[PDB]
Structure formats: structure tokens, C-alpha cells
Structure 1
Amino acid sequence: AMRQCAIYGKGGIGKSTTTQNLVAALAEMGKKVMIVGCDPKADSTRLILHSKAQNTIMEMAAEAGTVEDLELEDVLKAGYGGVKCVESGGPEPGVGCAGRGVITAINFLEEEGAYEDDLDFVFYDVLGDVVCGGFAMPIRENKAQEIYIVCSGEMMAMYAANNISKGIVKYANSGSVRLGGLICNSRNTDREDELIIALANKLGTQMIHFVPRDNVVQRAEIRRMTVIEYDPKAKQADEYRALARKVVDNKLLVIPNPITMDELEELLMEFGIMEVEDESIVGKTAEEV
């Protein structure tokens, strides 16, 4: 039926551009999609709308002052490929939980049954810098069944992926939340792909795709658009089509096996990212040794 997915990832590594280019490729495939951005900043839909920034629910839930009031023309703007783009926004720093913007928006959308109105895929675009009750909501309430984690060969990105996995673990029984795989957004780090493949193996999942750096992304980004609509004949455009088809045809939805800090640091060390500590010189000043 309609598939509900979520792309989780640490911020600062192009996750949203990947989510958006991913959904664009899906749209070109003739798939009906909707993006629910769950990022406070709200950049999960600009590339699809060619906008500077989309209006969030929170912002215009402070205009009419009451949670439910905004047919979808002011709140749910459809853009490229028929992809419906929505933004949750977040509350003011210090005003209740920041996941209030998320928890709000779904109910509101389930109230307009936007989920039932001709849809094949829904992708919540969520940040994983903090995996707390607020941001794990889509998972917790069983709102997102297929999770895909965007990460890079870096400590925090991999730490964030492990924590998202822990949160998937926690709810794998109460509902049907499952990890579809890891998406590595290359940051031009050596053995990055092999590091993520390794992490995929350890977590007991798969690195469903390696997204390369290709300046046509930054190029199309400036255009406030995806690499797909920009130049569908770009070599990078094919990487999204590939990822997209693996997502569509993904049978592998697992319950992850998180690793310990040692295992992670272990991984990071054998791939040349983290320095191996020399036990002897620990706590010795530069003059002593």
C-alpha cells in the first residue's frame, strides 16, 4: 500500500539534499510522494518547491493560534513531480519540547487524511543530532515503518546512526519499525564507503547506497533544486535513480544490532579515521616523553 518511511541523520552532511534528490528520482519514476520535514530550520522541501523557505505549521499555528486550521494550500504545497512538500517547524527555544512541531503536524495531516489522498510514499525528514522522545516520535508512535539512515565516515554521523538504531531497537516489538539500510553521503574521506559497509555489516543491515560528491549537486542546490530536475542527464542523477530503485525494491528491513563505543571506535581506528592511542605516553607531558 502506501509506504511510510523516514530518513534520519546527523545534520551538516547533506541529508536533506539526499532525501530530496531521492524523492525527486522516485517522483520521476511515476511514484506519488510527500515529504514531511521535521527539522526546526525547515530545509527538507526547498529544492522541491524552488523556494527560499517553506511556511511551517508551527508558524501559522501562531497566526490562527489553534493547532488545526489550515487546509492544505497554505500548509501542504505540492511542487516538482507532484511531490507534496510539508514542513513541521519547531517551537521557540525553551517553549515545551522541540518535537512539538512534529507531533503536531502528523495528527493534523491524519485529520485531513493527507496520507490517504493518492500516495505511494511518505518520507519524514528528521535530524538525528538528538534522539530523544521528541524526535523519535515518528518511530515511537509507529508513524514511520521504514527507516533509512544517512551518515558519513565520521564519528558523530556514525554515532548518530547507532543511536537511531538503538531507538529502532526499542520499538521493533511494539510495532513494525525496521531499518532499511544506511545511506552514505560521501564527504570525500578515504575508505568512507568501506567504513560504512563495515558499519552496515556490524549493525546487521546494509549500506543501501553510496552517494558521491559531485559539484552538480551544489550547482543545482543554488538553483534551489534537485540534481534530477536540474540536469536529469547528469551522472549524479543516476545515483539517485539507483538508490531510489533499491529503496522501492528493498526486501531487507531488519531490527538493528547496535554496537558499543569500543566497537565503533574500533571501526574508526581500522579505517584510518581515529588515531590509535599509545598507552605509554598517556598523561606524560611533552617534555617528559
Structure 2
Amino acid sequence: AMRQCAIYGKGGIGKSTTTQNLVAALAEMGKKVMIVGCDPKADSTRLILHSKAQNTIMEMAAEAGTVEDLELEDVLKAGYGGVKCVESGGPEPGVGCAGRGVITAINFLEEEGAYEDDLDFVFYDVGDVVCGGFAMPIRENKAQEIYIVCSGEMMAMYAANNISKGIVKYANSGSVRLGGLICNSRNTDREDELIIALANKLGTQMIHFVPRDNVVQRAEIRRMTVIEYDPKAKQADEYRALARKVVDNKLLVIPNPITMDELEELLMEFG
């Protein structure tokens, strides 16, 4: 039945290209998906939708100044492989925060009925923490699986450890676990091992090493996924291996976060 997954990690490492390309690889093997963009910089769906940008719930709300007065097809549009896309996030142009804009958006979706029967997966592309307004895409009637995108960079890994402290310190004993660490490459054979090393430190797995290949940037300036743009590329089979691993994955763990002294040790040992 409908698994609910959520992709956390920091910005600037390509987390949203990985999310779309995995979602496209899932669409392609028969799965029915919805992407829900819980990102202030709302951009998690342009590669599935071939969009300049997708209009958000928190921008079609203040626009029409609502309480309970917007529709589903005004915000949930379909794209590659029949994947359904929602944006939320940003107050932009208005003021405030975007974390609350996630709650006044997936609530719209629940009450609007977008979580229908044959949906296999719902993906939440959220951010740097598992707290309050950005932990909402992970509570009781929500995400039971969390995958962290990181890389062999100090800040990226420190965000992967801090997102993990938020998964253990979640508002009492519901079920939201850690599925794995997806790694978005930057260098050769001792970066995958560093993320495997952090994975084993926190009690998870590096569920896939996404290589750095040029087909990816060539697909995203042309507004597509590598699965759509070049289905025959080697990288295209990276997102299929990631997808099959996500589908079939059973290790959902409660992570054991490390000290920034321990993480200093790991980064000293690598670079």
C-alpha cells in the first residue's frame, strides 16, 4: 500500500534532481507517484512537469485570499510517467515563514483527497531539519520513511547528522524511521566509503551512490529527468538501481546520531 517517503538533506547538493530522477525511474517501472514540494525555494517538480516553475498552494492561496477556497487541479498537475506534482513552500512574494506553509498545504491535500487508492508512493522533498513545521510531512498519518541526500562535504554531512537527531527526538512514539542515505557524488572511491562509514555509524545504509555525470545537467537545462531524456544512459541505470533499492528496502531504523567530535574524526580520516 501507499508508502510515504520524504527526502531531507541540505541545499546546493542536487537533492531535488535526485528526487525527480528516482521518481521518474519509479514511474517508468510501473509505480504511481506524487511529488509534494515542501521547499521554500519551490523547485522539486520542474523536471517531471517541464515547467518554468509550478504555482504553489501558498501562492494560489494569498492570491485568491483563502480560508477554504481553492481547488485541487489548480495545484496538482501530472507529468512524466503520470507522476502527480504539487508545490507548496514559499510565502514568496508575501512575508512570514515557509515551514508553516507546508502544514497549510498537505492539509489542503488531505481534505482535497489526493492520496487515492492506487498511489504507491508519496514523496516529500523537504529540507535541513525534522522539526515542527518541516516534521509535519512525517507525523502520524504521514511519512514512515526518510532518506537523506548528502555528499563528502563537511556541511552536507553535518546536516545529515542533524536531520538524524531530529528523527530520534520526534514528538513521541509514532513511526517515522530512517530508510537510508542517498549520496550525491563529487569524487572517486573514498567518498562512497565515507558515507557508508557515516551510515554504519548512525545504524543505516548508504542505499545508493549517485555518480557525477554530465547527462544530468544536459537533462535539467532541457527540463527533463535522465530517465526521460536519455533512457539508455548509464546514469539512467543509476536511478533505476536506486529506485528498485527504495522499493525493495526493509531496513527502516531509528538512527544513532554521532558527536561533532566523532564526525571531526571521520572527516580527518578522509579529507
* TM band (smaller chain): over 0.9
**Deviation of the 1:74 alpha carbon:** 1.5
Q: Does structure 2 retain, via aligned residues, the 8 Å contact 1:142–1:176?
A: no
**Deviation of the 1:55 alpha carbon:** 0.3
**Deviation of the 1:121 alpha carbon:** 0.1
SS of 1:210's partner is strand
**Deviation of the 1:137 alpha carbon:** 2.2
Bigger mean CA deviation after superposition, 239-248 or 190-199: 190-199
**Deviation of the 1:92 alpha carbon:** 4.8
Cα gap change, 1:131 to 1:249, in 2 (>3 Å): closer
Aligned partners of 2:140, 2:150: CA distance in 1, in Å? 24
**Deviation of the 1:138 alpha carbon:** 1.6
Aligned partners of 2:194, 2:113: CA distance in 1, in Å? 41
**Deviation of the 1:164 alpha carbon:** 1.0
Deviations 1:147-204 (A, max 9, x none): 0000001111111111111111112852110000000000226621111000000000
Q: Does structure 2 retain, via aligned residues, the 8 Å contact 1:184–1:193?
A: yes
Q: Does structure 2 retain, via aligned residues, the 8 Å contact 1:67–1:104?
A: no
SS of 1:64's partner is coil
Cα gap change, 1:189 to 1:129, in 2 (>3 Å): farther
Deviations 1:185-236 (A, max 9, x none): 0022662111100000000000000000010000000110100000110000
Q: Partner residue of 2:68?
A: 68
SS of 1:268's partner is helix
Aligned partners of 1:211, 1:66: CA distance in 2, in Å? 41
Larger radius of gyration: 1
Unmatched runs of 5 consecutive residues or more in structure 1:
272-289
SS of 1:17's partner is helix
Q: Partner residue of 1:160?
A: 159
Deviations 1:221-278 (A, max 9, x none): 011010000011000000000000010000100000000010111110111xxxxxxx
Cα gap change, 1:171 to 1:187, in 2 (>3 Å): same
**Deviation of the 1:51 alpha carbon:** 0.6
Deviations 1:23-78 (A, max 9, x none): 00000010000000111111100000101100000111012211433322220001
TM-score normalised by L of structure 2:
0.95
Aligned partners of 2:84, 2:77: CA distance in 1, in Å? 6
Q: Does structure 2 retain, via aligned residues, the 8 Å contact 1:3–1:122?
A: yes
The CA RMSD measured in Å over matched residues stands at 1.7
Q: Does structure 1 retain, via aligned residues, the 8 Å contact 2:180–2:205?
A: yes
Q: Does structure 1 retain, via aligned residues, the 8 Å contact 2:128–2:163?
A: no
**Deviation of the 1:142 alpha carbon:** 5.1
Cα gap change, 1:67 to 1:141, in 2 (>3 Å): farther
SS of 1:111's partner is helix
Q: Does structure 1 retain, via aligned residues, the 8 Å contact 2:8–2:129?
A: no
Identity score, percent: 100
The size of the alignment, in residue pairs, is 270
Q: Does structure 1 retain, via aligned residues, the 8 Å contact 2:8–2:128?
A: no
TM-score normalised by L of structure 1:
0.89
